[PDB]
Design a protein around this ligand. Structure first.
Ligand code: PLP
Ligand code: PLP
Lengths: 360, 360
């Protein structure tokens, strides 16, 4: 009575989180109010709001000098808000182009100012992530933006470059808090919460405070990072139920053993599915190079569009949700974020085997 | 075991809505998923998403030519997005200045282009709403913006001007769907949902489609109205649980007899409290003129700051939440949105009487 949910965004939440939030949904901690009916400047909501920030940092080793912001508008709004805040006249926003979400991010930056493609995997049809360990950039680079996990193509960086005084910025929408990383490599990371952290309606932005101490004063108040830093994301009404749900997911992540624990669990999930593809005698084919494989979104094809359509419908009828890939990629996508249980992955590879043999 | 919740934003939800959403929070309609774990491009979420729009229009008499959008960022983001979309070079954004939220809206518009104060109640310290039936505006007016209910001052317009070819725009954050109005008077109305429609994290924007058929192409994609119109608010991931909760509130509003029913109920609630103030032999004093009184946010003072502090603490100890007014106004504010039951209002006037006599 739980669907095999492979949705890519919004996506699975841990059942335990759903049950906890359900239980106190009408009356939170005997206050006689739902968390949804409380003031965002009240102590009860504020405890949740602040706890979420601290837990998030703690999962990342609690490096100093970083502020966790909760901003509305999704990752797509960050695509504009980042160059609005950081792309000064005369500077160039540099992008690493690894597929669909990098392309969206670049497009927005061009509306705001000068851009440059600093690296690209388009020549491999996004199968081969670019090597970034070098990359050359200019002095007048405003930042280097990359996408840590290309949710649609199924490619994912294992590591990130040292960019010196050029701030590194990462769209980590589809893999944030799936794996340890060194936040100090980045000036800003961001993620719509709805892939690996909870509900839609909240974007987590973690920013180096020295980079946003004085935001451009010509910008709309709600599009300045300092509005959020200096007002603790409460300048206006925050997405308070969404942040409450992020806090509950963060508690769950710690229960699962933190980022190192979920990474191990996710590697196991992913390894099962990649093995099912790799041992399929070519019946299933991974979309990206082995060394670029994502552990969050596993993309693969069959020998024909007809077979892929059959896979999608038959999977849907056996209770799998969300496996059809994006049209630009075609084929299938198994999204296997933290909360997607190993059991769903087992069911999926069992199904993959049954399908293959039922076609054999 | 329900608090007497007079919070001003986020605020009370109907208990019935909380109970319905609690009941299907883990498993929505036997899908084996929460509504929160579903794809926003799936049929199940889409039914909710589209239903909410239709129900909203239906509550307003279903006038043609209007699109209901769900936008993130709160009403505060609309303060920028409205002039970004409508304040063309050479045109002037005209504002009606009625207190704190009008002032916030004007401030944002000045970042974007030329503004003008077309009417103001500042000379009455915002006690006396301006008469708008006339108002003079120029040819080069981009729009006339007003605030239908000034949530902090407790003032509210009973009616709106006929502005001809100049679009009328209304911030109805704190009174939307509390009363019938003629949507055809407006080119755009908007409201953060968290005052009278549900959860925080969603802003309802209802726009005349002929006004936004081609939004300014220099704007960030997420700050164009046509992105939302043409993609049915699903260009990116929407605040899907928030929209689900708005849909549930809209069902409740219809159950309560629609806008005409809730208006009557709210008038009764409000009348009880205004009577308690007016019959108090001056112990309680309304902040605004009788003819400008809001039925959503009732503001009042006592003879001294000391008495007001006593009121606030004693009310808090008897289980009233949120009655302390904003500092700029001082005194008290009873926020009595649709979902605040008559019973809370009864408890409040009983308390007001007990307090008064316990000081007498
Ligand atoms: C889903 C996704 C986005 C878009 O997020 P929204 O909240 O829908 O704007 C951006 N980047 C990546 C990597 C994503 O996976
Ligand atoms: C609360 C309120 C706002 C601000 O809404 P946010 O969602 O917090 O940005 C704007 N206008 C009015 C009239 C309000 O009552």
């Amino acid at each position: 009575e739980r669907a095999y949910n492979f949705n890519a965004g919004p996506a699975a939440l841990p059942l335990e989180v759903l049950e906890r939030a359900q239980a106190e949904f009408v009356d939170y901690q005997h206050t006689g109010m739902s968390i949804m009916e409380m003031s965002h400047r009240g102590a009860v909501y504020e405890a949740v709001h602040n706890e979420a920030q601290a837990r998030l940092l703690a999962l990342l080793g609690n490096p100093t000098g970083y502020k966790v912001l909760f901003i509305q508008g999704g990752a797509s709004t960050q695509f504009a808000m980042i160059p609005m805040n950081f792309l000064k006249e005369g500077q160039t926003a540099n992008y690493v182009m690894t597929g669909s979400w990098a392309s969206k991010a670049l497009k927005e930056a061009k509306l705001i100012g000068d851009t440059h493609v600093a690296a690209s995997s388009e020549a491999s049809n996004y199968m081969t992530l670019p090597k970034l360990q070098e990359i050359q950039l200019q002095d007048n680079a405003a930042y280097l933006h990359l996408t840590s996990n290309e949710t649609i193509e199924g490619a994912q960086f294992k590591a990130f470059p040292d960019t010196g005084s050029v701030p590194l910025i990462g769209d980590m929408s589809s893999d944030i808090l799936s794996r340890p990383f060194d936040l100090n490599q980045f000036g800003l990371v961001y993620a719509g919460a709805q892939k690996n952290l909870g509900p839609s309606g909240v974007t987590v932005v973690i920013v180096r405070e020295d980079l946003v101490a004085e935001s451009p004063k010509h910008l709309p108040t709600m599009l300045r990072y300092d509005t959020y830093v200096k007002n603790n994301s409460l300048y206006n009404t925050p997405p308070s139920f969404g942040i409450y749900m992020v806090n509950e997911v963060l508690k769950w992540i710690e229960e699962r053993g933190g980022l190192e624990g979920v990474q191990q669990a996710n590697r196991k999930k992913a390894s099962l599915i990649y093995d099912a593809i790799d041992q399929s005698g070519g019946f299933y084919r991974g979309c990206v190079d082995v060394d670029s494989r994502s552990d969050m979104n596993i993309t693969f094809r069959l020998a024909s569009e007809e077979l892929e359509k059959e896979f999608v419908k038959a999977s849907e009828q056996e209770g799998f949700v969300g496996l059809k890939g994006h049209r630009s990629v075609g084929g299938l996508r198994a999204s296997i974020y933290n909360a997607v249980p190993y059991e769903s992955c087992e069911a999926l590879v069992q199904f993959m085997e049954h399908f293959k043999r039922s076609r054999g």
